[PDB]
Ligand binder design. Structure first.
Ligand code: FE
Lengths: 197, 212
């Protein structure tokens, strides 16, 4: 019959777990509220965009980011939970990099933000490792036939970001202007930075 | 653990529910969604009751149909609650009483785990390695698509971490190992039935052996 267990509403179960622990003095005052603020306000792909724009305008930093990602990120003070050992992977005219956690959802939280529903989906977890070109295509990114795709499966403690290619038409842009076109999806690797017409 | 969570390479799924740069909305789509991670950190950092590895494993231990029908954040509510009961901190009775209804949990572990292996090799960038052809019923950070397959070392980490197969069961013998970015050709993993180039898997030293 392949039946599923009858369950109380998820909100009731989640708050039950909170109340059971809190009622036993195991949750410090303002603890979950503090985490919610960190997750919503601090952990953000704006941080990864800042790192990319710096790398694009500063060859010395670019080299540091690609050789010791952790150190480069630390310079900005952006190390944190699920982002303690950082590797940045470089897109090239012949290579497109893409990140997944096939086993769960592992993501460089502090610099990419918490993963989106789609990244944590069974569809993405199952398919991108095996058919990344078709997956990106379906998502709206056409990777040229003469460009290799490399998928990084986040299976241990390395936390990844993609350093995308800098698009033509951005020559001389400020770091702020560049940051604007480096989206969360560019950092994950499923999108290429876009220059307006 | 060869569970339904080991999804890479499974066929039959539909479209990824996203178009690039589409609005994903707020970080949390319901008022409870911050609770699983925050209560996990209370357990890990404040109580010292379990590791993050035990959280991954308890989610792997959801009954398989239960795993498949449960949304992401809810799996972690179930997982963290299960660990709190297994560690003797909470009871299922009090969870269900407070919830006002059923709160089924992950299944008990069927493995005690395994220690970090004593015999391993320090590998260098460019070296060819094979993923050990081993079956582990408890927690392991090796997706089955790479078991027994051969790849090249692209990175050896400059830090070391406890062996997941041990710490994921709360064992005292997890030691510490570096991990290796191992690059596999797509055809090594999926033969002709792939449209990719290469796949890089971040593998603990204890999962590897010299190639041939
Ligand atoms: Fe994950």
């Amino acid at each position: 019959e392949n039946a599923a267990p009858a369950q109380a509403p998820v909100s009731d179960r989640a708050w039950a777990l909170f109340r059971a622990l809190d009622g036993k003095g195991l949750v410090p005052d303002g603890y979950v509220e503090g985490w919610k603020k960190t997750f919503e306000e601090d952990f953000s792909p704006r941080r990864g965009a800042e790192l990319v724009a710096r790398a694009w305008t500063d060859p010395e930093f670019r080299q540091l980011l690609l050789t010791d990602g952790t150190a480069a990120v630390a310079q900005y003070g952006y190390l944190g939970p699920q982002g303690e050992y950082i590797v940045a992977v470089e897109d090239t005219p012949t290579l497109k990099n893409v990140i997944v956690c096939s086993l769960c959802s592992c993501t460089a939280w502090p610099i990419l933000g918490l993963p989106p529903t789609w990244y944590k989906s069974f569809e993405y977890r199952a398919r991108v490792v095996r058919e990344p070109r078709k997956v990106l295509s379906e998502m709206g990114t056409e990777i040229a036939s003469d460009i290799e795709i490399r998928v990084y499966d986040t299976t241990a403690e390395t936390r990844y970001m993609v350093l995308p290619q800098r698009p033509a038409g951005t020559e001389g842009w400020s770091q702020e202007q560049l940051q604007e076109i480096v989206t969360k999806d560019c950092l994950i690797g499923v999108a290429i930075p876009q220059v307006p017409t | 653990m060869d569970g339904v969570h080991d999804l890479a390479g499974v066929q039959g799924f539909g479209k990824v529910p996203h178009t690039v740069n589409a609005d994903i909305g707020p970080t949390f789509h319901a008022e409870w969604e911050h609770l699983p991670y925050s209560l996990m950190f209370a357990g890990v950092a404040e109580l010292g009751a379990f590791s993050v590895d035990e959280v991954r494993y308890v989610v792997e231990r959801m009954e398989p149909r239960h795993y498949m029908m449960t949304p992401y954040y809810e799996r972690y509510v179930i997982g963290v609650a299960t660990l709190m009961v297994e560690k003797g901190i909470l009871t299922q009775d009090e969870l269900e009483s407070l919830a006002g209804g059923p709160f089924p949990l992950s299944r008990p572990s069927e493995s005690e785990g395994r220690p970090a292996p004593v015999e391993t090799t320090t590998f260098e960038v460019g070296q060819r390695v094979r993923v050990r052809d081993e079956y582990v019923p408890g927690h392991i950070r090796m997706p089955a698509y790479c078991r027994g397959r051969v790849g090249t070392i692209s990175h050896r980490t400059t830090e070391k971490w406890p062996f997941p197969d041990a710490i994921g069961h709360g064992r005292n013998d997890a030691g510490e190992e570096p991990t290796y970015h191992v690059k596999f050709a797509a055809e090594e993993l999926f033969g002709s039935d792939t449209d990719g180039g290469s796949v890089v898997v971040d593998l603990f030293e204890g999962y590897l052996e010299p190639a041939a």
